């Protein structure tokens, strides 16, 4: 009986990248090949495994992480990358084993006035650890003078809205992303492709 990837890929609304969602997949069968062969994705990049082998393999756990970023940020969803998404929003570990899958969602996630519901973190005192999640909204102290929870000179609200509008250049359009991590831990391996 088949993995609920449908609940992740086809959710009506995705998370903001700073508040990225994660579904723990277990005890099921997954046709990775129909995903990989689908014309609907613009990015399908597997690290430490071949996409055409996934139907043949089993894992302890698959994590399906999901969020929205702008098209020109999709390259930052990769091991060893730098920039505001990789540093402050969603960070993959150096030894990542998984696939990064993205598609243009301009038709779903942009709005005539601007969609203010998708944000990213623009400032943080340190880089995230791999798979760390920060949903805090404290004013960021950029300078020496104290903010006291008030936006002001060198005192910034740390989240910025993408404000996606349908008329934006395709690099500024919203992309839906799903990261599949394939985890192999001391347990026996319940999450299988059909051919395993």
């Amino acid at each position: 009986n088949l993995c609920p990837f449908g609940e992740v890929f086809n959710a009506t609304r995705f998370a903001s990248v700073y508040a990225w969602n994660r579904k723990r997949i277990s005890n099921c069968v997954a046709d990775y090949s129909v995903l990989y062969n689908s014309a609907s994705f613009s990015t399908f990049k597997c690290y430490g495994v071949s996409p055409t082998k996934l139907n043949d393999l089993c894992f302890t756990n698959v994590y399906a992480d999901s969020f929205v970023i702008r098209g020109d940020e999709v390259r930052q969803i990769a091991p060893g990358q730098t920039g505001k998404i990789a540093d402050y929003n969603y960070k993959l570990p150096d030894d990542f084993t998984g696939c990064v899958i993205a598609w243009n969602s301009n038709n779903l996630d942009s709005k005539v006035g601007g969609n203010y519901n998708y944000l990213y973190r623009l400032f943080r005192k340190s880089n995230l650890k791999p798979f760390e999640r920060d949903i805090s909204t404290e004013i960021y102290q950029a300078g020496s003078t104290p903010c006291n929870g008030v936006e002001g000179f060198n005192c910034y609200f740390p989240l910025q809205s993408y404000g996606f509008q349908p008329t934006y250049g395709v690099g500024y359009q919203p992309y839906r992303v799903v990261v599949l991590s394939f985890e192999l831990l001391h347990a026996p391996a319940t999450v299988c492709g059909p051919a395993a």
Partner: protein, 113 residues
């Protein structure tokens, strides 16, 4: 940096003309192992596969990591978004860490008259 650059982003033509679209894999440690093109009809969201054949000619230069589509004898019904897809599948150039594909941002084609 690592991207498929697709030119032109937009064109207008008259029917009976032809059009070339050029894609190059820039700033990548990965080899171009295989290429694919898709068409979204103006007003549809389904991506149609485009084969090498008929009014469609598909070429690849692996060494410069470029690939093109030439459409011959353009019709009004050719109007829409064209996407190119670059596959890196050997993932055995030393610094290339991924296997799979990346696409350009597309070409919006308007065919008139």
């Amino acid at each position: 940096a690592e991207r498929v650059e697709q030119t032109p982003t937009t064109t207008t033509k008259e029917a009976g003309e032809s059009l070339t679209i050029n894609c190059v894999l820039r700033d990548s440690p990965c080899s171009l192992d295989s290429t694919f093109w898709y068409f979204t009809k103006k007003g549809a969201t389904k991506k149609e596969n485009l084969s090498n054949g008929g009014r469609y000619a598909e070429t690849v230069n692996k060494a410069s990591k470029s690939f093109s589509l030439q459409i011959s004898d353009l019709r009004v019904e050719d109007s829409g978004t064209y996407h190119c897809r670059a596959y890196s599948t050997t993932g055995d150039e030393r610094d290339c860490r991924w296997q799979g594909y990346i696409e350009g941002y597309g070409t919006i084609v308007t065919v008139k008259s």
